Design a protein around this ligand. Structure first.
Ligand code: HEM
Ligand code: CAM
Ligand code: K
Ligand code: XE
Ligand code: XE
Ligand code: XE
Ligand code: XE
Length: 404
């Protein structure tokens, strides 16, 4: 616990630990949702992880993401030493500077690229699920959730699959550190990996995502090698952690809810709507901003340099945004969330993520329509910048499946 700063009033101190929150055994989303009980203010300070503000309601989260002149992305991670070392592009830049790098990043993960990968995405999903289907069981996080999105990303980036354990280890240290590595060490290891590859693909340009970034232009002038490395590293982290973790929350839910499986089996055209409602309920990202100056925000004096967590996860769990927010309703009329962020840093990979989610749901429910959590298993979650599921043992009767 870190000393309460002079300017923070005692009545706003809620000691939430974003990397190990108290109620984690109830589920990670439920654990973060304690910040939205009736007694907790819209905006609290925690003395954990070096001390920082935490906006607890959607209205505040949205407002702060919109207002980049006060809430800068120059230092977006907690703790402060991670935020300070964080220099990925475009996330560590504010508009106007940030904008030129988004266009280039859209070339490698945008909707036209998803469209092109659509065949290989469908093929991999079907191939992984068919391999599992006759077994009547799997360790879902390791047997599908990791390989499906990771192999697609490695394909797109033109990187060998033998590199996956190394890269996955590093990305995990940046979002859910286990203590062995600081954020800055993990980041420099990722850069060290990328540097020779970026140099090779600048000499010998190809079709892969690293070539496209490394040989690209930003508003009409050549990207530097340094800029290319800082963008490629961001893309790697996005590719190796987000969808991986979200698939496991979604499948855990479906494994526990037969009526929700039945709804999608009966009406598969609802799968896109169900993806969105699962993105609200099992939102999993929480990063933030740093104050560029002293600023009074919703009755609370913030000091220049203060860090504020603006949990993208919380907005759609907010009762004030969505009635009965812990209930999953595929017919929910207005699904309101900030799962893919908000403002000028809106997720660039969201079209790829939705596609992978939708393809997974359709292809899993076609072949393995009925499945359950393995008898006796208690599923454990983990919290951090991106929250996750430690393991997800599933079982089914093969007699109920169908090869397609
Ligand atoms: C379930 C899947 C995903 C979720 C929930 C998610 C969430 C987010 C969020 C909340 C942000 C904004 C962060 C901020 O404002 O500081 C973001 C940005 C970003 N994401 Fe995603 N993401 C997902 C998948 C992906 C994938 C697969 C990629 C592929 C590389 C990706 C690439 C990016 C990039 C490049 C940005 C930065 C945009 C900018 O700073 O201008 N994301 N993501
Ligand atoms: C918070 C994010 C999900 C977003 C894309 C990858 C991630 C970990 C970042 O550093 C920016
Ligand atoms: K920084
Ligand atoms: Xe990518
Ligand atoms: Xe990349
Ligand atoms: Xe899923
Ligand atoms: Xe389905």
């Amino acid at each position: 616990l870190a000393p309460l700063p002079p300017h923070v009033p005692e009545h706003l101190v809620f000691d939430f630990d974003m990397y190990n929150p108290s109620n984690l055994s109830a589920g990670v989303q439920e654990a973060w949702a304690v910040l939205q009980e009736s007694n907790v203010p819209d905006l609290v300070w925690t003395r954990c992880n070096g001390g920082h503000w935490i906006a607890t309601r959607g209205q505040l989260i949205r407002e702060a993401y919109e207002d980049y002149r006060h809430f800068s992305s120059e230092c977006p991670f907690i703790p402060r030493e991670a935020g300070e070392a964080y220099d990925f592009i475009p996330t560590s830049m504010d508009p106007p500077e940030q904008r030129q790098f988004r266009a280039l990043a859209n070339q490698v993960v945008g909707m036209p690229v998803v469209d092109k990968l659509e065949n290989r995405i469908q093929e991999l999903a079907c191939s992984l699920i068919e391999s599992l289907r006759p077994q009547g069981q799997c360790n879902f996080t390791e047997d599908y959730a990791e390989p499906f999105p990771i192999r697609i990303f490695m394909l797109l980036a033109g990187l060998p699959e033998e590199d996956i354990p190394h890269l996955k280890y590093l990305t995990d240290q940046m979002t859910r550190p286990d203590g062995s590595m600081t954020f800055a060490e993990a980041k420099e290891a990722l850069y060290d990996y990328l540097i020779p590859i970026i140099e090779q693909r600048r000499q010998k340009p190809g079709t892969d995502a690293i070539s496209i970034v490394a040989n690209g232009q930003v508003n009409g002038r050549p990207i530097t090698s340094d800029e290319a490395k800082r963008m490629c590293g961001l893309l790697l982290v996005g590719g190796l952690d987000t969808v991986v973790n979200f698939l496991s929350f979604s499948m855990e839910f479906l494994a526990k809810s037969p009526e929700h499986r039945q709804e999608l089996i009966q009406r598969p055209e609802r799968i896109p709507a169900a993806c969105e409602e699962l993105l609200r309920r099992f939102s999993l990202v929480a990063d933030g901003r740093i104050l560029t100056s002293d600023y009074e925000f919703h009755g609370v004096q913030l000091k220049k340099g203060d860090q504020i967590l603006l949990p993208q996860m919380l907005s759609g769990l907010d009762e004030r945004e969505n009635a009965c927010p812990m209930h999953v309703d595929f017919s929910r009329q207005k699904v309101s969330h900030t799962t893919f962020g908000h403002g000028s840093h809106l997720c660039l990979g969201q079209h790829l993520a939705r596609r992978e989610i939708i393809v997974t749901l359709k292809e899993w429910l076609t072949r393995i329509p009925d499945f359950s959590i393995a008898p006796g298993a208690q599923i454990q979650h983990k919290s951090g910048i991106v929250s996750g599921v430690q393991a997800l043992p599933l079982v089914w009767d093969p007699a109920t499946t169908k090869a397609v």
